[PDB]
Curated annotation (Swiss-Prot), chains A, B, C, D, E, F, G, H:
The glycosylation pattern (the amount of mono-, di- and non-glycosylated forms or glycoforms) seems to differ in normal and CJD prion. It is linked to PrP is found in high quantity in the brain of humans and animals infected with neurodegenerative diseases known as transmissible spongiform encephalopathies or prion diseases, like: Creutzfeldt-Jakob disease (CJD), fatal familial insomnia (FFI), Gerstmann-Straussler disease (GSD), Huntington disease-like type 1 (HDL1) and kuru in humans; scrapie in sheep and goat; bovine spongiform encephalopathy (BSE) in cattle; transmissible mink encephalopathy (TME); chronic wasting disease (CWD) of mule deer and elk; feline spongiform encephalopathy (FSE) in cats and exotic ungulate encephalopathy (EUE) in nyala and greater kudu. The normal, monomeric form, PRPN(C), has a mainly alpha-helical structure. Misfolding of this form produces a disease-associated, protease-resistant form, PRPN (Sc), accompanied by a large increase of the beta-sheet content and formation of amyloid fibrils. These fibrils consist of a cross-beta spine, formed by a steric zipper of superposed beta-strands. Disease mutations may favor intermolecular contacts via short beta strands, and may thereby trigger oligomerization. Contains an N-terminal region composed of octamer repeats. At low copper concentrations, the sidechains of His residues from three or four repeats contribute to the binding of a single copper ion. Alternatively, a copper ion can be bound by interaction with the sidechain and backbone amide nitrogen of a single His residue. The observed copper binding stoichiometry suggests that two repeat regions cooperate to stabilize the binding of a single copper ion. At higher copper concentrations, each octamer can bind one copper ion by interactions with the His sidechain and Gly backbone atoms. Monomer and homodimer. Has a tendency to aggregate into amyloid fibrils containing a cross-beta spine, formed by a steric zipper of superposed beta-strands. Soluble oligomers may represent an intermediate stage on the path to fibril formation. Copper binding may promote oligomerization. Interacts with GRB2, APP, ERI3/PRNPIP and SYN1. Mislocalized cytosolically exposed PrP interacts with MGRN1; this interaction alters MGRN1 subcellular location and causes lysosomal enlargement. Interacts with KIAA1191. Interacts with ADGRG6. The chain holds residues 113 to 118 of 253 of the full protein. It is found in: Cell membrane; Golgi apparatus. This is Major prion protein. It comes from the Eukaryota. Its primary physiological function is unclear. May play a role in neuronal development and synaptic plasticity. May be required for neuronal myelin sheath maintenance. May promote myelin homeostasis through acting as an agonist for ADGRG6 receptor. May play a role in iron uptake and iron homeostasis. Soluble oligomers are toxic to cultured neuroblastoma cells and induce apoptosis (in vitro). Association with GPC1 (via its heparan sulfate chains) targets PRNP to lipid rafts. Also provides Cu(2+) or Zn(2+) for the ascorbate-mediated GPC1 deaminase degradation of its heparan sulfate side chains. The gene is PRNP.
Length: 6, 6, 6, 6, 6, 6, 6, 6
């Protein structure tokens, strides 16, 4: 599971 | 902007 | 399962 | 999944 | 500009 | 997962 | 900007 | 500008 934002 | 998965 | 938006 | 905007 | 993927 | 904006 | 995974 | 991945 993983997530990223900018 | 963002993204996620599992 | 996964998702993304911008 | 992928997304982009500008 | 923005982008994301997962 | 990855994301970027500018 | 930030990201996390497990 | 910003970016992240995991």
């Amino acid at each position: 599971a993983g997530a990223a934002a900018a």
